Amino acid sequence: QKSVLEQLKQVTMVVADTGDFELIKKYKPVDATTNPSLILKAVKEQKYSNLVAETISKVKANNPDLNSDDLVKEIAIEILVSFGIKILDVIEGKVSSEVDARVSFNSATTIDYAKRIIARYESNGIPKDRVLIMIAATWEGIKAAKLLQKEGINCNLTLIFDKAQAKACAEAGVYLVSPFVGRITDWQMQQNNLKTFPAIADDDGVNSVKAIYKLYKSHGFKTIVMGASFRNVEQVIALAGCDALTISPVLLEELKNRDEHLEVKLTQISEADFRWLMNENAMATHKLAEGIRLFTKDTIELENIIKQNL
Numbered sequence: 001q002k003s004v005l006e007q008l009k010q011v012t013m014v015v016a017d018t019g020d021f022e023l024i025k026k027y028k029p030v031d032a033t034t035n036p037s038l039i040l041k042a043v044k045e046q047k048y049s050n051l052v053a054e055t056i057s058k059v060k061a062n063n064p065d066l067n068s069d070d071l072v073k074e075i076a077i078e079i080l081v082s083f084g085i086k087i088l089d090v091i092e093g094k095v096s097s098e099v100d101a102r103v104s105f106n107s108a109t110t111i112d113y114a115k116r117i118i119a120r121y122e123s124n125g126i127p128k129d130r131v132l133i134m135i136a137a138t139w140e141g142i143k144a145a146k147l148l149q150k151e152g153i154n155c156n157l158t159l160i161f162d163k164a165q166a167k168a169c170a171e172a173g174v175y176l177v178s179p180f181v182g183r184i185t186d187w188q189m190q191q192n193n194l195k196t197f198p199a200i201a202d203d204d205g206v207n208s209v210k211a212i213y214k215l216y217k218s219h220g221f222k223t224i225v226m227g228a229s230f231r232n233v234e235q236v237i238a239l240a241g242c243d244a245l246t247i248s249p250v251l252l253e254e255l256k257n258r259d260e261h262l263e264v265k266l267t268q269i270s271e272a273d274f275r276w277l278m279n280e281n282a283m284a285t286h287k288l289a290e291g292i293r294l295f296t297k298d299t300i301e302l303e304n305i306i307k308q309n310l
């Protein structure tokens with residue numbers, strides 16, 4: 001009698017959503033993802049302070065020409081990479097590293113940031129095939145990802161809240177999309193001051209991923225659909241069969257400790273078109289923007305921590 005976690009792995013690529021590599025080992029996910037909030041958490045909790053201190057010393061040594069601001073930016077990238085490297089030691093698949101959320105509306109600076117991350121991984125002996133560059137799915141992010149994919153850099157288009165938005169990502173040939181589930185359900189609950197989670201059939205977040213999956217499979221899009229942002233284990237279970245699901249260590253532990261039967265449930269857009277379709281979706285418009293704001297705040301806090309340790 002396999003746990004729900006082991007049953008899930010039979011039909012879905014399980015991915016760990018964390019920067020805490022020591023936790024990853026015990027769940028044996030295929031891939032791992034680290035957003036700016038998770039990098040911040042890992043750095044703040046100080047489980048890896050030596051790794052951080054060493055990263056700061058290394059970057060200073062190799063960059064005697066950089067001023068304070070430029071140096072901090074280079075250290076921030078090296079920290080993302082350092083965590084990714086430690087994760088890659090304990091998984092067989094890929095790790096996702098996110099570009100600075102502040103470049104979300106600039107395709108050119110997104111491209112350059114993505115390339116810098118990739119170059120730092122390569123300088124450290126990690127080939128680009130083991131990495132996904134995570135980019136917020138604004139029109140600018142998708143356009144950047146289109147170019148990056150053409151140049152062999154696989155991308156993880158995140159902060160996906162609308163089906164049309166997911167369709168445009170697939171049209172750009174992106175490797176993977178991360179449709180959010182929990183934040184969509186959060187909007188749904190706040191709309192009507194719901195205190196309890198909706199029934200699964202009525203969960204807007206779960207339904208959004210189901211609709212994206214259905215679209216991708218019927219249209220033959222090869223982009224991987226990876227559900228992300230979970231509020232509870234029931235939302236993860238509801239998406240069993242999805243191509244991939246990125247899950248927090250807490251929820252992975254919950255899945256590992258449950259042993260009931262797991263029902264397997266899942267088995268040409270122009271810029272103007274894209275902007276129109278996103279505008280029609282109040283939730284998506286708000287949540288994409290909020291996501292970028294929140295990740296920005298966490299990136300700024302990480303910068304502040306770096307600055308205090310120079």
Ligand SMILES: O=C(CO)[C@@H](O)[C@H](O)[C@H](O)COP(=O)(O)O
Nearest residue numbers: 017033035158178182183228229
């Ligand atoms: O999409 C990814 C990685 O592909 C995750 O890192 C999400 O950023 C995370 O799952 C959001 O979770 P909440 O912040 O909504 O709890």
